[PDB]
Write a protein that binds this ligand. Structure first.
Ligand code: NAG
Ligand code: NAG
Ligand code: NAG
Ligand code: NAG
Ligand code: NAG
Lengths: 107, 121, 431, 431, 431, 121, 107, 121, 107
């Protein structure tokens, strides 16, 4: 129903600075979620509230920023860290729309 | 500890009604986390949330899909099911059951394998 | 059971409870018929039957000679409502015409549903075992006036039959005509079952009450109408559990203190206790005498509940940056304590206290640090705070953590007044 | 009963009560003589008499092995005074010389008035039924040492006779030598009547107590002196109602909230409870465990009462413009509740709550408005505040209304601190 | 006993008490075996044995259908800890495997020490008298199915034997499966003695508990596990007094008011209650339901105690010029009251109240002055404050006086806010 | 609901003592309103208050008439009476019993019909 | 004992503005009372506190004023509103003196 | 009312161990005042405090004499004793038992007569 | 262990101003005590806290002073007031040392 603009895909080498951005039309405050999905697998919850780190997740996945700028960063890329990363909005249900999806592949 | 496993009929005839179910092993629904939620992923677009139910019975449904969804939960058998009517060609996708991460009020932390119905002719 | 440790305020909210709320009072009327006992006498010296007759007669005659701190507010209102309803229905029944109508209704049966002149419908029961005994066996056994009859069976049967009557008299006289709870002499299990089945509510509530009838008995009580002729008339004000299987949760807290420059600044959430949801209405049950848990179900009284705004649930998420005036106590003196939670335990200990957790296998596991700390039940069995051993609960459920800089540590407290007993969180921090 | 609804503070004062105040303690001494029971034994296996003997002996031996929030202040002082007086008189009696003097006084009669060496005069009673039985019937029934005698009458009589002794031992051991109330085994109805007639007070008080002796029993309690030889010596500290038929009244209040610009400003009178007049002295009874009503008479304890100034009655008329520092709680969060009054009910409900009154005839009568509202008992039977049904009282009396702009609405509240738990009305409004 | 009247704050500290603190809970498991009672029936009309059988069966079946205000904080934590420990051990025992292991352990003896799978060691007792009776005497007495047997001895013996079982069922059903205290039916004196001797503590504590076992019983309680087959399994959570003969003291206070220019300025110490010392640790026991005195020894619960700093003892010497934030209530309205102390009594009475002391010999001795005043027990027997007679204690001990200008009179109180419920003494005076 | 009805002797001989009584129907004295008050209206002047009694027994009397008035109340029979001694010619008027309107502490809200004694010769 | 000056009588037609004044020697504050008496009938309490209206009284009877001026006003005169109207003082008992009486008759 | 009376052996051989005892008449140790204290007065200097015991058992001793003093109290017999080892020539003086004046925490209010051991040859 | 300097002895007549001084090395605050000992008799407690007067002591014994000056004064000397007067320190137990002793004799 709502369209957001983000890169279709991105490529880099192991240990590179991986950054993702998820845009919203209305408002998110802090009810933003992050999911990682490998091909043929269900998404994985990594960050809830856009700043809280789910238990059992590597410290590389982190999210900072204040004011109007928000983004997800992956500092230490790993071989098992190549997949599509969606985003979700839980502001004002039952409007909960995932992102189109961002895919990261090796060069 | 907790494993959501979708179940249902793998063969669903066209124009029929959409039925889905989920289960939880190594845990309870009645007092699980709550918000036993449902999801579908249509080919072409991304993921879409239909609705959820609570451990007591509160049932929230998508504004642009709540006219047909009746999501129920059963605290005895420990399974929350789905019922989708008026299936169309655009409703052919992968449907997921999941569990919510009650941080503020809701987030997703657990997902199922995914029950797919294949149409071949 | 889901428990979330909210590290912002050193508090834990445990949700997953199914409500059982009392919505009304169901009145049951009893006529403990004693019989023509005062007309009989013993004239051959002491005897077992004489002693039992004297006890019964004294019981009868002495019976003739009888008749914002939200927690405090709520329990007072609850007791006032209960006593007022009981006394009002007792007043409606105390009329001679009403008593005669009740007796006529019960004259040919042992249970009938009478509509009182005051417009209320009340069930009625006739406890006529004692009267039937006194009239058919005792009266013809003590003829002439001799109570020293050779039959000891008669004396023992008299003792058993008047056990209930003497117990009722004991309870009413001791409590001055108003008992605090329903003894098994006021209403037996079968009578309670019948009164539950006759309740004006739905099948689910009736079944849950059939299962938890002894909780019903615990929450009920009785009242004495009076002594009419030779019949003790009393009523039992039973609780109606008109709501079942609704969401509820409990909040617990411990002093969230933070040291800086040798001084501390503590806080403690004053909005602790039980909550429940009812068709878009959140109800606070703040006083500590009406909300009892039994497994997954929590039993509470709706007369002791305060209708709090919905929004009040936002203090469990963003207490700091919420517009609801969340309640907290405040001070500057550290208090070290262990606030046991349903599935874990909050451990606070600061300068001058040593903490440590352990189990029955190994005494000591580790030495806890300074500050508030969530100890999971699955982690350990007991925790110590200075020669004081607290044993954790063994309930099963998933424990969560909500990371966040504690308010006590992240805000500059109000210089004066610091000690506030029960105030909005705005006044204390970030004033 | 006259009830006046004072609309200035959403409070109702109900006057027309006749005081019954306790002014002193009357001590009664009992010597529950058991007899030479420890010297007897059973040597032919189990028996009814053996079981009763074992119970009695265990009871005896285990007996040998034993021994400004005005509401809180007042109840604490009351309990302290009661326990202190009881313990002091028990200490005076615990002397061997004093016990011997008491026994000698009671040696030839069953009741005598002995003046203790400590200067106080105490009545004494001898409960010698158990000893006389154990000495004249039981001792000669169990000769040789055979407790399996064919006579079941003797065993049943033993059970009845030692019922009182075993009950007293149960109560004292369970409560550690100090019971909370006078069971019917501590003092029977006849003994209580004699102790009432022997009280050092006037005819009117004596007659009122003769009528309300079970209230006397409720307000009394007992204490264990000790076990001397084979005799249990205990005392009962009865209450002296030296004042009767004096004015009294009760005050009730509910949150008087007032909305403006979306914010509220509530108040609640903290000087609620019972009051009474005594020869130019007004006495406040603020704690909730000592003031019980019975019809038109109100029973209270003078040790639990605070001597308040006369002038304090002016807060019921011009609380706003009176020079007495009237006490009120304060805040800014609305609380919707129903504060039942003796003849009516104060109904407060504001933003987010729906109110409505009704009766058993027709469910719904009307939809109440926003703000505080006085519902007369003669008007309706029940009132609802959101799925919560409160039933009004059916006491008869004239209800009044005192028109006046409420203080909460007519004054500008103090900006900071707003939440004050218990303060003078000056600090909150019109500071 | 040494009492020092500290005239600086109108308070008295009474030291010379020997601590008895409870450090842990000792769990005892009972299997009240009832026997094959449900399989038996009566088919010849009413009878004594029929009534007793019906009572027992109803009891069994209904049993199957069952299951910073430091004072408030501390008592709540204490009750939470007790209930949590009891419920956790009950959960560990409720397993079928654990119950079978307990029964197998107790199969060949009447008492065995079993180590539960949860790692905790609990004593076990088998109350098999009722089962043995029901199986060997009752079952073969009621053959065929006739309960109207000629033998009344059998019926009376059945009543006596099932007395304990029926009492236990009464207590559990009335309290909903959790009793508040250990009746003599839950655990008899001999069983309590055995459980005390089996406690994991030292000889001195064991001996003191052997002497004060009825205090142990008062402080204990029980819990119902469930009904397995035809056997009621319940447990008793006894208190472990692991500390004895340690220093303790009690603090009492009365309003220290001082008039100037017609206005007053009162204060009241809020840190009243019991204290005790334990190896360099001072423990505050602020809630009023857990600290009971018996002569020179004071019994308290360590779960209800708050670990206060050592330094806190300096408020008893230089409350005014100490760096510890001593707690006091404050106000401007005089309150006249008598705060009875262990050996004396603090008398406060100001404008509008008359005071006077006396004795049983002579009614009136003297007219007390205005202000706070220490009345020694050796001086008089009673004191009056306006038709209100308080009787002093007759405990023996030396009384002291600590001269010093009272703080209320020597400092200028804070103008606003004056009424503070519970604050540091800094905020009120010499702000 | 409440009706105060004066009672007494309609014929009172000169130089005797003045006796008056009042009653309340549809209500109680013992807990009525209180202050069962009395009044007289001498010809020539207006109305004059003599004294009153309370439901308990407190009895206030006019400063310039309290030397002779003894106003009593009886909570059992529900009647408060009057007793006036040293009657004169100036004491011939209409005497009223009334009930008080406890607003501040006292106001009149209920009055009786009025008992008059007529002297003819 | 105390004498106050007020008009002996007043006359007017139905619907006229009827005003009464009751003077006091000492002090009244707000303990003033108003009574209406018809010929051969007992007085009727209408206003207590000089500003509070007794239940069941027509709204025409009203009393306003602040400072040193006080008076009773009758705006809508009625046929059954012709009688003598006294006043009473409850300041400092047992001194409670009614007024001499004011009578209103039709012209 | 209270009289502290020293007791012990009046003849103590040189090089032996120093033993002393005190008693209280007309009062109790177990709950007396507390701090049953001890004192000695060597010829040449003044008075010197060794140590004390409490009614419960706390025992404070002089920093420069605590290496040898073991002051005990007995609540049953109502006597607190002293035990001093390594006696020398400088330890010949008058030793006093006393009771403390719990004003702040300790002051002396009661003293004994004084037990002296005399060495003659 | 600690040595303090004070007069060995002092003499005067009855009714003279008798003043004593007790020095300390560390600190005393208000835990100072005063004792009077006659020849062959135990000391007597007169003042505790250096300012509080023990019950049953003549008013002549008194102690005043603030800041850094403290001293005991005897204004009205009496025939039974000739003896040695020690001092004691209860600051920081178990360090409790009496004074060397001051003796007053008639001239
Ligand atoms: C029996 O006693 C009752 C009161 O219990 C009395 O009404 C009745 O008249 C008595 N019967 C006879 C025959 O005296
Ligand atoms: C606090 O959290 C609630 C959660 O429902 C949210 O609606 C609200 O906006 C938050 N408060 C602020 C000031 O953002
Ligand atoms: C009987 O027992 C008592 C104690 O109860 C004892 O004093 C007495 O000596 C005993 N009598 C005999 C004859 O042994
Ligand atoms: C308040 O009312 C009382 C009623 O007795 C009155 O005496 C007092 O003067 C009033 N207060 C003021 C300030 O007028
Ligand atoms: C208060 O008295 C204590 C007693 O131990 C003392 O240590 C402390 O120094 C005193 N306070 C001040 C400020 O001198």
């Amino acid at each position: 129903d709502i369209q957001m603009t983000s890169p279709f895909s991105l490529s880099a080498s192991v240990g590179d600075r991986v950054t993702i951005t998820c845009r919203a039309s209305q408002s998110i405050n802090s009810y933003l979620n992050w999911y990682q999905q490998k091909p043929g697998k269900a998404p994985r919850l990594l960050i809830y509230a856009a700043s809280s780190l789910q238990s059992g997740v590597p410290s590389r996945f982190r999210g900072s920023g204040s004011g109007t700028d928000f983004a997800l960063t992956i500092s230490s890329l790993q071989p098992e860290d190549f997949a599509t990363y969606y985003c979700q909005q839980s502001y004002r249900p039952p409007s909960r729309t995932f992102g189109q999806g961002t895919k990261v592949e090796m060069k | 500890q907790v494993q959501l496993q979708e179940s249902g009929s793998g063969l669903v005839k066209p124009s029929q009604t959409l039925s889905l179910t989920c289960a939880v092993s190594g845990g309870s629904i009645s007092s699980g986390d709550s918000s036993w939620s449902w999801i579908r992923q249509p080919p072409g677009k991304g993921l879409e949330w239909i609705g959820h139910v609570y451990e007591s019975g509160n049932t929230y449904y998508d504004p642009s899909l709540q006219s047909r969804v009746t999501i129920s939960v059963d605290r005895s058998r420990n399974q929350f099911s789905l019922k989708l009517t008026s299936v169309t060609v655009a409703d052919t996708a992968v449907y997921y059951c999941a569990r919510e991460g009650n941080y503020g009020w809701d987030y997703f932390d657990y997902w199922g394998q995914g029950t797919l119905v294949t149409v071949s002719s | 059971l889901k428990e979330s440790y909210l590290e912002e305020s050193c508090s834990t909210i445990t949700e997953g409870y199914l409500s059982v709320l009392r919505t009304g009072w169901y009145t049951n009327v009893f006529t403990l018929e004693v019989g023509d006992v005062e007309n009989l006498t013993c004239a051959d010296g002491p005897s077992l039957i004489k002693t039992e007759l004297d006890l019964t007669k004294s019981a009868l005659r002495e019976l003739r000679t009888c008749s914002f701190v939200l927690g405090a507010i709520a329990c007072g209102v609850a007791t006032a409502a209960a006593v007022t309803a009981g006394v009002a229905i007792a007043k409606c029944i105390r009329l001679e015409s009403e008593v005669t109508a009740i007796k006529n209704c019960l004259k040919k049966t042992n249970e009938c549903v009478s509509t009182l002149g005051c417009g209320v419908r009340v069930l009625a029961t006739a406890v006529r075992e004692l009267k039937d005994f006194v009239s058919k066996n005792l009266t013809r056994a003590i003829n002439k006036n001799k109570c020293d009859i050779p039959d000891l069976k008669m004396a023992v049967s008299f003792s058993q039959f008047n056990r209930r009557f003497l117990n009722v008299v004991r309870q009413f006289s001791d409590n001055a005509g108003i008992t605090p709870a329903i003894s098994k002499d006021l209403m037996t299990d079968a009578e309670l079952a019948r009164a539950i089945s006759n309740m004006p509510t739905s099948a689910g509530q009736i079944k849950l009450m059939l299962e938890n009838r002894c909780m019903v008995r615990r929450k009920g009580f009785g009242i004495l109408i009076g002594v009419y002729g030779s019949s003790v008339i009393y009523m039992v004000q039973l609780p109606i559990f008109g709501v079942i299987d609704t969401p509820c949760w409990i909040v617990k807290a411990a002093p969230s203190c933070s040291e800086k420059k040798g001084n501390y600044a503590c806080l403690l959430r004053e909005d602790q206790g039980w909550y429940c949801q009812n068709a878009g209405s959140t109800v606070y049950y703040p006083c500590e005498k009406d909300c009892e848990t039994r497994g997954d179900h929590v039993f509470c009284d709706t007369a002791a509940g305060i209708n709090v705004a919905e929004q009040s649930k936002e203090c469990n998420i963003n207490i700091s940056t919420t517009n609801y005036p969340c309640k907290v106590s405040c001070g500057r003196h550290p208090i070290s304590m262990v606030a046991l939670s349903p599935l874990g335990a909050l451990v606070a200990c600061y300068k001058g206290v040593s903490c440590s957790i352990g189990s029955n296998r190994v005494g000591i596991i580790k030495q806890l640090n300074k500050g508030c700390s969530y100890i999971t039940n699955q982690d350990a069995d007991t925790v110590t705070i200075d020669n004081t051993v607290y044993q954790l609960s063994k309930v099963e459920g998933e424990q969560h953590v909500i990371k966040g800089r504690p308010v006590s540590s992240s805000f500059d407290p109000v210089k004066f007044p610091q000690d506030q007993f029960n105030v909005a969180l705005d006044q204390c921090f970030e004033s």
